[PDB]
Every structure is written in structure tokens, then in C-alpha cells.
Assembly symmetry: D2
């Protein structure tokens, strides 16, 4: 089943501990017995029903203001929920992260009153699924070099181009898309502008879902725009100032999505330790051998260290302290440790770890993503280094 | 395409270099454009035709005596061919290794004249596919604790039980099976006996092929024996002395299968470097950035070091020097480095590395096996440590 | 100078932040300009004066009850002070840790009222220097196999034997020594008994200080007992029950001494980052190159992660939650990361890092200890593994 | 003593094996019982006598032509001798490397007939000690940015400036110095010119020897030139073409000095394994525990892999194949593995490993150099990456 989580060390209040317990129980009831089928089929059959169920719990829009139906909690609760969902299933965890943190949080931070009232209630209730589009086939890490055109004609902007790697692409009812309004600006950051593109608008179509190594079931597609007219009302923040929105979104995205590797490491431990104490070779349980004890110690220590790092940084960001380098470092460290722990878990399982009946391969394939998505490891290292360069200069 | 391989450093004679070139050309013509389809379908459609083609080249039974149609070459040529095939496709490489090294080499080393004449010609020609069975559901690394029964009645032994994880299981026409004839021997090693079980004998049936994380297409099944009568003529070596056969086979198996990680690392480099010099971000090729240059340096140095280690140890074993600890260390080091290089290659590709259109995920999933098959990493470390314990004691 | 420490992320209250600032200022004034001389001379000239100065601040016996003059604070403050002192100088940090945590804490936890009143005031004031003796030349990690004899004659126990590796050995006025009273007990743990041996008693002499690779200046010697008569009043806890005292002391020792690697990593960062932004090669500061930025990112992330882990575990232990495996894991992770960060700092400095004028070599040599002292890394891994074995069994 | 070296795997001919045996015997007789004293005193008392003894064996100038008294052997023999000397003592190994490879090889490759006849006989015989000067206080890795001035007046060049980090500085009778003749050349490489500066010339003085972390005893100083007049006859190669000489020297320097880490790893194994089979804890030798067996396996495999890499690359370079990237990679891999093995050896020794009586700390401090000297690790990674960039461009 699910190993107990020592919340005394994590320094979680009673309310947060209750939230974790409720989420764990609900996910073990509903999401957990479907993870293998989701991975195999590369499709979540009950995505909308599950989204409604999550909306009933209030985890969708957990950081959204109460007036729109949100829980109005902090980022620590958000990473708790994200960690639990990723523990239950990696792909559903990624889809939930993209829906809540990327879309709802961006709306509540950089949205007009009318836009909030129009979109947030349905997104929080779970009726609408959200997504964020900033990457392009030629501009994945160099986001400011996007090629999407957002020329302005009359009172409505006309969009042409395509965006790539959009999580929840084909299923999104509300999408936040970054486009370059001013292609002739001297700094490419100035040209960027954020728009709210909703499903059904003429010219907005999506390609077929991608076939991915891991995180299968989190529908990822390519957005296609052909003379799609976006009314001026659907503009986040202000025109030609979407770079700041993009950067703040990136910081909070890294901070929240750092919860995913925590969930994957917790799942690896949950499946490894009981097996190590059940499987026996050479006349005793394989867990009694010194090498396996060392493996368990390494996995446990890495998980605990990353968990403490993420929780403390989230607590700090709740107060108001948000620095780019810390938000990069948390996810960088968590992703690397998660990949190592997943490989170690496959090794501990051994022969049975290499077949698809056991979920260790799924854990490895899911964990490999977080070193690539939301900016690769090299990008995060450069961000931290440049943050150091800002001082002592 | 295929990057050039510096054979001047490897210290390969002209004949071996010609062998490598011929194998590379043939595999690029035939096997290479089928690797992705083999991985996706979990089945090699042209396995028997490809085996006949390999038999025409003589790579099957490359170490077998010439009188049976073999090339009569050394282990260095064997690891060369294994490396090339693994470079073309990991699963076919594993199947070839199991066919040649595990079966044909065991026959030529521990077989009677009649058994050799009966089996070797067809195995070398490619008409028959070979396999070796020593692992069981409860005895994977603790091989001496196998439960297969080999009771002797009259002049024919009767077998009951099942063996697990047999490469080339469903397709094998000749199989070498280890069974415990004397279940009451004080040392479990004494009870073990090797038998030649051929396809079609009553009571010998195979289960459905496994669904594996990687190496998909190398048909792995479970052998089922129910009152199968094996004539006494089908005994390798001598009765109750199969432990020595098993150990020598394990040593040579590790030495030859160390060529697989070399092929996988070479494939990772072949697909990574041109892409790093084609894909461009921030106004220049991504290969020009210092972090990517460091990644390339690490991958190249690890590949070269492992290649030199394997080649030198194979050359030594050709002369007659075969020590258990060296044969363990070569594959241990190669497997660990191969896994690291595969992860690094996925990272270098980035977003495109995570989709199944590009083969980086396939390389990672294939490379993870060699830390598990032919004895896990922990077993090899214990073997080396005990080899040290033998001295200074 | 000293880089700022982000206490917002660490979740430190205002009082603890003030404590850290006061300690940093005092150490930068007094201890810091003497670290190189202490390392070179292998001797702290002003040890007693510095101990009196520390006693004035109250850091000595920071966890001791107020009635004896202690501050009566928690373990978090203790690791804060230990981290600051280790940041100023590793050897003085180790000496302070041995004086406070090993001696004073053991006295306040497992001491009679009379023993407390006799010893604690002077130890806290700084007049007396404390030390703990549990390791022997043949029993370093296997502590229960100590050979020190503690035979009982009349009302006073007579001690014969020798203890090794005692920090603050030659300078200790009060020493806590573990000896085996009952050498014939079936479990060796039962024989162990703790005694309070004070300087000047006949038969108690110390050898010459050791010449160590690092931590030079923390006087380490060998205790020699020859028919030394210890009165029965000088017994910690109860006779033949010192094993529990030893184990609790080991747990708290690991928890507090985990602060040392934090100080060493902080010092490495403090000396590395400004130099990386001052030294210039190829026409720009070496800190602007991508490889150096990656090095800085790795060092910073490792430091932050270990700091969060240690602080959260100390906070938990303050409440009352103290588990052996967590207290082992904190120091294990911290020590390994500290060694890696020290090597990285030497590399970043380059040529100047290899000379003794710069402190990078001192940082490496000091950091190597924490993987050896207070139980090696292998012992901690075994402790964590056995803690897992206790459950699921 | 000295563990046997498996030369069957290394593929060494009988002559090379005899050379290794003779060098090992001689060094164990003379150099070995002095290593600790050399490290402690930071001075080799018998440097000149030992140099004469080495000249008698012919190891000095082993690659030099026979007509000057050299052995006329290849680079493989050179790395063999370097490895043996480094195994005996790291500092003497570095001094020998600087004397032979840096000076004598440079003379035999880029020297006039008169210069060869004047200098080589005495350098090979051991009467003169050689050294190479290319690094400066501000130009360590950016060698082309050296500031030494070599203005030409009449028929003799006048030198002003200073060079730093010169191995065998104070003891060198012949020195090869690189200076910038044309400070106004558009490429800084064109300005560089190589000179032969001999001891005793007016204006040429040396500073006090450096106090280093490791490699103590290899006298390293700073060269000081003040209006030193160098006759035009003392020019290596041709004027304003010393960049090619410098680069070829760097390549061969890396290739030969890669033998040093091999010697250090061999010494670590030689001191670790017997101790692991003598020291006993928990009622058995510490070498029998699984963790220690894993440590031994890792150390042995890393040593063997690096040894095979270096030997094969040296064999290739003997034939005529010398590529920059391979010569960089060999030393990069060897240095990193040597540092890891030294740390592991200190850990295996444990408490005794931390004192200066045992040589494990000396091995670590010596091994740390090769990641810094002869170009740091980052420089080598950049060299390999740029070598890849040259192709596919
Ligand atoms: C499963 C999945 C889900 C995704 N979901 C989303 C989503 O919801 N929203 C979204 O916007 N995107 C999403 N993405 C895309 C992802 O955010 C980007 O693709 C990622 O940041 C890298 O994109 P890329 O491969 O184009 O980077 P590339 O630029 O193509 O990467 C090239 C390589 O070079 C390295 N590199 C790049 N620049 C430098 C440099 N300056 N110095 C050194 N090295 C460098 C990179 O680390 C990488 O290894 C998703 C991707 C995946 C796989
Ligand atoms: C794709 C594939 C192909 C295969 N092909 C073949 C084939 O052709 N022929 C064949 O005979 N087998 C084959 N196998 C099986 C393989 O050889 C064994 O399964 C492998 O050696 C490990 O088996 P296991 O999982 O049962 O080991 P387990 O004993 O179940 O492993 C348990 C775990 O404990 C560790 N462990 C075990 N003993 C110790 C110890 N004493 N100390 C410390 N740690 C220990 C192991 O490393 C492992 O991590 C194949 C397996 C795979 C996945
Ligand atoms: C014991 C010893 C013996 C020596 N003997 C000799 C000798 O005989 N002859 C001789 O000529 N020299 C000798 N040296 C000097 C040595 O060759 C150089 O000092 C070395 O190459 C580095 O010098 P540096 O510290 O000045 O490099 P720095 O440039 O000061 O190094 C700064 C740091 O930045 C890194 N860095 C530099 N450039 C880049 C870049 N472009 N991108 C990324 N990172 C970068 C470096 O790796 C290093 O970590 C010796 C040094 C020592 C310690
Ligand atoms: C600077 C310094 C200060 C010190 N200060 C103190 C002090 O104040 N108080 C004090 O009591 N001690 C002190 N010590 C001693 C220290 O606590 C012990 O020496 C340490 O725990 C290891 O001792 P050892 O070398 O005898 O261990 P050993 O048993 O000799 O170590 C042998 C090696 O085998 C490994 N090993 C041991 N058992 C096992 C096993 N079961 N399985 C696998 N591997 C195993 C160990 O990790 C080690 O690598 C100090 C030591 C130093 C260097």
C-alpha cells in the first residue's frame, strides 16, 4: 500500500496533514488502480469525471481566491496535492499541474476582473480544463525567440503560427498562449504578449496527441492557428509586456512542479521497500544484505532531503519571498534525485523490475521528464549562475 | 549515419577491422531500418531469415571450430560482432548473443563428439536457434537454488518444473537447460546437471512472450516441463558436474555480452553528435555551448575507456588468461557507463528525446538491461570482492 | 567577507536569526583571523581564553538548563552555533562540538543532581573543558567490543586500559569514559558502563597529540588508565546500563555534528564566489563561463538542500521526535555533500587553490573527517537499513 | 609490499614487462622508504644523486635518440616509468615527468643539431635537471595571454617579466621558456616564441619554493627575469612560431602525465587491500563485509579501465596517430578516477586513514593535482568539445 509519511519532520500543520491524508485516501481509491492502464493506453478515459471529482475536493484552484470558489491556500498545499497526485500517477500529476498552476494561477495573478469572473469559476469547478502554451518547435528553451504572430487589425488581434508541446492540448477549453505582437522590437522580450484563447474559436485546431517515452496519458499536442481572430478583451496583463508574466509563471511553475519528483520518489520507495522485505534469495530476505541496505539508505536520504528543500522553499514563497535561483534549484535538485532513485528502484527489483507488469519502469520513464520539461537542467543551472552573476558585479 | 570508429587506438588488426566494416555495412543495410518497428511491435518478423543471412556471413558460431562450419576466431571478433549488432538494434543484439555465446560456445566447450556433430552444423548455419536456460522464478541470482527436477528412470531422465527468463525461448530449436539431478547433495552445486533439450519433445512447452521495458523483440518466455523424458545421450559434460559448466559459461557470457553496452553507447553518440551540430538555439548550434561540450566530452571518454577495457580483456582471454573478476568487471563498468551515457543522450536531445519517434528512449530502455541480466551489478561486485578475498587469506 | 545567509528560507525565528548574527560577528572578530595559523601550528594557543569568551556568550551549554547557567535552548540553536564556529574554523568547531554536545548534554541527560551541580557550572562557564571517550584502537565502529576494564573493588571502581581518538584529550578537565564492567555478560552491550573521569586522578595520563590530515588544532590524544580508582559516585546513569546512554549520545552527536559540514560548505561558498567574480581569464571573469556557472549552481543547491534537511530534523527533535535513522541520514548526506563541495571549490580556485595560502585545501581536509568521525558512512548506511528492517518484519 | 600487476591484460611485450619489473624493484629499494619524509619535509634531499641513478638506468630521456645516450623507446615505456615513479612517490613522479617529457622531449622534437648536442647529453645523463615554463600569474589556462616580454636588440633577445608555477624551478639547469616576441600581433599565438634559458645567466633568478597542498617535494617556484639577454642561438623551432611547439608539448605532456594518476591508484590499492584483509571488526576481517567488497570492486575496475585506456592510447601514439582530443581525454578520465579512488581508500582505512602516519592522505593530496595541472578539467572538456565541433561544421 502507501508507506506512512513522517509529517513531524516536514513541519506541516494539522490542516496540511489532514489535506495530505484526504488526498492520499481519495487517490488510492480512484486514481491508483488506473495508473498502469493509463500508461498502457496513453489515454485517461475518465479525465473529465476525475476533474469534476477533484473540483469537488477543491484541489483545483487551491491557490485561487475564495470568491471564485477556490480554497485560497498557499503554495505549500499546492505542492502537497501535486506530490500526492504524482505519487498516484505521474501523467495525471502533470496534467493537474498544467491545469492548476499554469492556467488558474496565471489568471488570478495577471487577469482583469471580467476575465477572472468569466473563466475562473468553471476552471476551478472542473468543467473547463486549462493549459499554457509558450513553447514552439524551434523555440523550446529560447522562449523569447517564438515565431507566433499576433498582428492587430481593428479591435481584434489575428493569430497565425503554431505552438508545440502543450500539455492538456486537445482537452483544453481555456488556453493561455504567448505570441509576439511586435516582431520588430529591439529586445525580443518586448514583442511578447499573452492571450486567452478558448476552444472553438475559428482557426484554432489541434494536432494528434504525441507518443511519449513516459507521462503517457497526459495529452500533449501541437496548437495550430490560421487567421484566428482574438478579441482585444482576451489579453493577460498588458500588450507588449507578457515577458514579465512569462517569467513569473516560469518561477511558480518550477516551484510547484518540483512536487512531481517528490511524488515519484515516494512511489518508488512505497513499491521497493515491501518487496525488498518479501523477496528472498540465498536463504534470507534480499533486504538484509548490506548492498540493499545501502540502496535503501541512499533512496530514503535523497527523498527526505529533497522533500525538506521543496517544503521550506514553498513556505518561504508563501510569506512573499520568491527568488528565481531558489525556485530553479528546488526543481533541479528534485529532478536529478528522482531520476537516480527511479534507476535504483528498478535495480532493487531486478528481473521483475524490467517487465511492464511492475511499475518501476513507468516510474523511471515518468521521472526522466522533469529534467526536460519546464526548462532543462542546463537552463536551470544557467539561471542560478546568472543570479549569482547579478551580485558581485 | 554511422560515425567512424578509430580502430588505430583500439589496436585492431586489419582482418578485425575488415570484419567490423563488413558487419556495419550489412547491418546498416538490413537490420538498422527495422529497429524502431521491432521495438514497437515487440516482435522480429524476419528472425529466421535474418538468422540465415547471419549464418551466410559466418558470424553465427564465429568462435566455433571450422570443421563444423564456424569461423574459428577469438572472443575479440565475437565482441566486435556483438557490439555492431547491438549498435544496429539492442534486442537483436541480445538475441544473437544468447544464440551464439550461450548455446554454441557451450556446446563446443562441453559437448561430446556426437552431440557436436548433431547440433552444431545447424546452429551455425542458422537453421536452428539456440538458447540457454538457468534462471527460475525463485532462483535468478542464486542459481544453485534452482528447483527443476531431473530424476533418472531407466536410461532417460524425466524432467519436471519450469525455467524463467529464457531469451529466444519460443523460437529456440535447441536449448541448454540446467537441472538438479541430486536434490539431496550437501552442496547444492553438486546436484546441478546440464541437459540438451530440443524443441518438440513431449512435455516441453513455452508460455507467452514477456512484455519488457526494453529489449522488446528479443522473445523471452518461460519454459514448462511436465514429465519430459530426456535421453541420457543429451547430457553436457558429466552428470552432477554441471556447476563448472555453468560457471565457465557465466564468465564467457559476461565477457561477450559486455559488447552490448559498447554498441548502445556508440549508437547514442551516433545519434547525438550530428543533432547537437544541427539543432540551434540562442542564435547558434547547441553544440557550441560549454555545457553541451562537456556532455559530449563525458560521453566520448566513457565510451572510449569502456571500449579499451573490453577489447584488452578479450584479447587476454583469447591467449588463455581468463579470470572471473576481470570478466565480471568489464561488464559491470560497461553497463553502468552505458546507462549514464543513454540518460545523457536523452538530455542532450531534450524535448525530441522524450518522444518515441527518436530512438534515445529506446537506447535508455535497452541499456538498463545489462545492469540486470547476466547477473545484477551487486552480484558482480560480490564476485570481484570474493576474488580479492581468495588472495590475502 | 561573509556572504549573507537567507534565513527566510530556513524558517528561523527572529531570536535564532539574532543568535546567528551575533555568533557570526564574534567569530569574524576573534576566531576567523586565526584559522590558518591554527591549522599550520596544529595548536590553538588561546583555547582556554576563547572558551571563557564563548562561555560569556552562553553558547557553551546552550541546551543546558538555566539553573546551571545554560541558555536552555533547543538543538536548532546548537546546530546554528556549531555551523557558525565550523564556518570560522573547522578544528575549533569540532572541539566545541565535543565539549558541548558530547559532554554537557550527556551530563544533563544522564546525570545525578550532585554530579550536575558539581560539574555543569564550570563546564558551562568555560573553566573546564569536556570530552567523551568511547573509541579504542581495536574498537572504533564496533563500540560494544571495547576492552577497557572497570573492575569493582570496595566502593571505588578500578580502571585499566586505554581509549583512543579522544577529542580535547590533553586539555579536558572532565571526561566521560565508557568501560566494560561485566566482561562476561552474554550481550556485550550489558557490560558497558559510563564513568566521569576528571583530570588529575592518579593513573590517568594522556599521550601526545595526533598529527592529523585535517582538523589540525583539535587536540586528539590517547587516554591511558593504569589502576585508576574511580569512586562509585562518578557513574552516569546506572551500572551495566551504559549502552542506552551511549546510543542516545550517538544519535544526538550525529544530529548536532551535522552542523559542521554545513559550516564548511558555507565557508567554501564564501571564498569561492567572490573569487570567481574577481579572477578573469580569456578577457572576462571566470564566473561568466557556463562550466563555472554550473559549478556554482551545484554547490549552492547542495548546500541549501543539506541545510534545510538538517534544520527541519533539528526542529523535529526539539519537539520530541527523535528517530535513529533520521539522525544518521542528516549527517551522512551532509558529510558526503560537504566533501564534494570542497573538491569543487578547490577546482574552481585552480592553481591558487592548491597552495596553503588559500584555505580551500584546509576546507577539503576538514570536510573529509565527517565521513569518518562519529561513525563512518558505512555504519550510518547500515543503521538506516536496519531501521527499515525493523519494520516490515 | 607491491601487489602484482597483471601485464597479460595490459598487452605488454616481454621487454616492457622487464622494464616495469626493474623500475619497481629499484624504486622499492631507493625511493619508496623516503616518500613520507619527502612529503613531510617538502624537500628531496637526494634529488641530484637520485637523478644520476635514474640516468644510469636510462629512464631519463627514455624517448630520446640513442645517439645522445637515450633509450630510443616509445611513449608506452615512458608512461610505464612515470606510473612506477608516481606509485613510489607522487612528487618525485611529477618532477621526473617535468624533467623528461617537458624538457628532453621538447628538445628532441623542436631543437637544432647544435642545441641537441649541447644540452641533451647532460640532461639524459642526469647531470642537468630540466624544466618547462609557460604559465604566468595572470595566464594559467589562457596561455596565449602571457605577459613575458622578449624584445630583440642586436643579436641577443632581452627578456623581462616573470613566470609562475615552474616545476623543478630552483633546481633546473636548463629551462624552456615561452615568451611573446611580437606583442602587437593580431593573433596572440603568433607573438609567442620559445627560448632555452640556462641557469646562471645574469638577470635570471628564482623565488622561494611554494608550500603546496600535495606533491610536496617537487620544488615549484617563480622565475624572475630582469634584462636577461638570451642569445639568438637559444631559440627552439623558429621565431614567432612557438605556438605549435607549445601545443604539441601540451598534447604529449597530457599523454605522459596521465601515467601519474595510474601510479597513485595503484598505490592506493596496494595499501588498501592488505589492510582490508588484516583489520578486523565485528569478529571478522572488514574486507568480508559487502560494502567493503563493493568499494574494492569499484576501485579495481576504475584502475583497470583507466590503465587500459592510457596504454592503448600510448600504443596508438607510438605508431604515429596523435589526436588532441584523445590525449586530453586520457588524462581527464584518469585524474577524475584517481581522485575518487583516493577518497575511497581514505574511507576504507577509516580512522587510521586520517592520520599522517599512513599515506592515504598523501595519496589524496597528490591525486588532486592532476585535475589542476597540465590544464584543468574544464579546459580538457572544452578541448574535446571543440575537437568535435571541428567536424560536422
Ligand atoms: C512531456 C512534455 C510536456 C511538456 N509540456 C509543456 C507545457 O505544458 N508547456 C510548455 O510550454 N512546454 C512544454 N513542454 C516543452 C518543454 O517546456 C521544452 O521543450 C523544454 O524546455 C525544452 O525544449 P526543447 O527540447 O525545444 O529545448 P532545446 O533548445 O531543443 O534543447 C536542446 C538541448 O540544448 C540544451 N541547451 C539549450 N540552450 C542551452 C544553452 N544556452 N546552454 C547550454 N545548453 C543549452 C538543452 O538543455 C537541451 O539539452 C513539454 C515537453 C515534454 C517532453
Ligand atoms: C531481458 C532479460 C533477459 C534475460 N535473459 C536471460 C537468459 O537468456 N538466461 C537466463 O538464465 N536468465 C535470463 N534473464 C534473467 C537474469 O539472468 C536474472 O533474472 C538476473 O540475474 C536477476 O534475476 P532475479 O531478478 O531473479 O534476481 P533477484 O535475486 O530476484 O534480485 C533481487 C535483488 O537483490 C539483489 N541481490 C541478490 N542477491 C544479493 C546478495 N547476495 N547481496 C546483495 N544484493 C543481492 C539483486 O542484485 C537484485 O537487485 C533475463 C532477464 C531479463 C530481464
Ligand atoms: C603543483 C603544480 C605544478 C605545476 N607545474 C607546472 C609546470 O611545470 N609548468 C607549467 O607551465 N604550469 C605548471 N603549473 C600551473 C598549471 O599548469 C596551471 O596553473 C593550470 O593550467 C591552471 O592555472 P590557473 O590556476 O592560473 O588557471 P585559472 O585560469 O586561474 O583557473 C580559473 C578557473 O576557471 C576555470 N576556467 C578557466 N578558463 C575557463 C573557461 N574558458 N571556461 C570554463 N572554465 C574555465 C579553470 O578550470 C579554473 O577552475 C603547476 C601547477 C601546480 C598546482
Ligand atoms: C579527527 C578525529 C576525531 C575523533 N574524535 C573522536 C571523539 O571525540 N570520540 C570518539 O569516541 N571517537 C573519536 N574518533 C574516532 C571515530 O569515532 C572512530 O574512529 C570511527 O567511528 C571509525 O573508527 P575506526 O577507524 O576504528 O573504524 P574501523 O572499524 O577501523 O573502520 C574500518 C573500515 O571498515 C568499515 N566498516 C566497519 N564495520 C563495517 C561493517 N559492519 N560493514 C561494512 N563496513 C564496515 C568502516 O566504515 C571503515 O571504513 C575520532 C576520529 C578522528 C579521525
Amino acid at each position: 500500500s502507501l508507506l506512512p509519511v513522517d509529517d513531524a519532520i516536514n513541519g506541516l500543520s494539522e490542516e496540511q496533514r489532514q489535506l495530505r491524508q484526504t488526498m492520499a485516501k481519495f487517490l488510492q481509491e480512484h486514481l491508483a488502480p488506473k495508473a498502469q492502464e493509463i500508461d498502457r493506453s496513453n489515454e485517461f478515459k475518465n479525465l473529465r469525471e476525475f476533474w469534476k471529482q477533484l473540483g469537488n475536493l477543491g484541489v483545483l484552484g487551491i491557490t485561487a481566491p475564495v470568491q471564485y470558489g477556490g480554497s485560497g491556500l498557499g503554495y505549500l498545499e499546492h505542492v502537497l496535492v501535486m506530490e500526492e497526485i504524482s505519487r498516484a500517477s505521474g501523467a495525471v500529476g502533470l496534467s493537474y499541474g498544467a491545469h492548476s498552476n499554469l492556467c488558474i494561477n496565471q489568471l488570478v495573478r495577471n487577469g482583469n476582473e471580467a476575465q477572472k469572473e468569466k473563466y475562473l469559476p468553471k476552471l476551478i469547478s472542473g468543467e473547463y480544463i486549462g493549459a499554457l502554451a509558450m513553447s514552439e518547435p524551434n523555440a523550446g528553451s529560447d522562449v523569447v525567440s517564438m515565431k507566433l504572430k499576433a498582428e492587430k487589425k481593428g479591435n481584434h488581434y489575428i493569430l497565425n503560427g503554431n505552438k508545440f508541446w502543450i500539455t492538456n492540448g486537445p482537452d483544453a477549453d481555456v488556453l493561455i498562449v504567448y505570441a509576439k505582437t511586435d516582431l520588430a522590437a529591439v529586445p525580443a522580450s518586448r514583442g511578447i504578449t499573452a492571450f486567452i484563447v478558448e476552444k472553438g474559436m475559428p482557426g484554432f485546431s489541434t494536432s494528434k496527441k504525441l507518443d511519449k517515452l513516459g507521462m503517457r496519458g497526459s495529452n500533449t499536442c501541437e496548437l495550430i492557428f490560421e487567421d484566428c481572430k482574438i478579441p482585444a478583451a482576451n489579453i493577460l496583463g498588458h500588450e507588449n509586456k507578457g515577458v514579465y508574466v512569462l517569467m513569473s509563471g516560469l518561477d511558480l511553475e518550477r516551484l510547484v512542479l518540483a512536487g512531481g519528483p517528490l511524488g515519484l520518489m515516494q512511489a518508488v520507495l512505497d513499491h521497493t521497500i515491501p518487496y525488498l522485505h518479501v523477496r528472498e534469495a540465498f536463504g534470507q530476505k534480499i533486504g538484509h544484505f548490506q548492498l540493499m541496505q545501502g540502496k535503501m539508505a541512499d533512496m530514503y536520504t535523497r527523498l527526505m532531503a529533497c522533500r525538506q528543500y521543496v517544503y521550506n522553499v514553498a513556505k518561504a514563497c508563501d510569506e512573499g519571498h520568491c527568488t528565481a535561483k531558489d525556485c530553479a534549484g528546488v526543481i533541479l535538485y528534485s529532478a536529478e534525485c528522482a531520476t537516480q532513485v527511479a534507476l535504483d528502484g528498478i535495480q532493487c527489483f531486478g528481473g521483475n523490475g524490467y517487465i511492464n507488469d511492475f511499475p518501476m519502469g513507468r516510474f523511471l520513464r515518468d521521472a526522466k521528464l522533469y529534467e526536460i520539461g519546464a526548462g532543462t537542467s542546463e537552463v536551470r543551472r544557467l539561471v542560478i549562475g546568472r543570479a549569482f552573476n547579478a551580485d558581485f558585479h
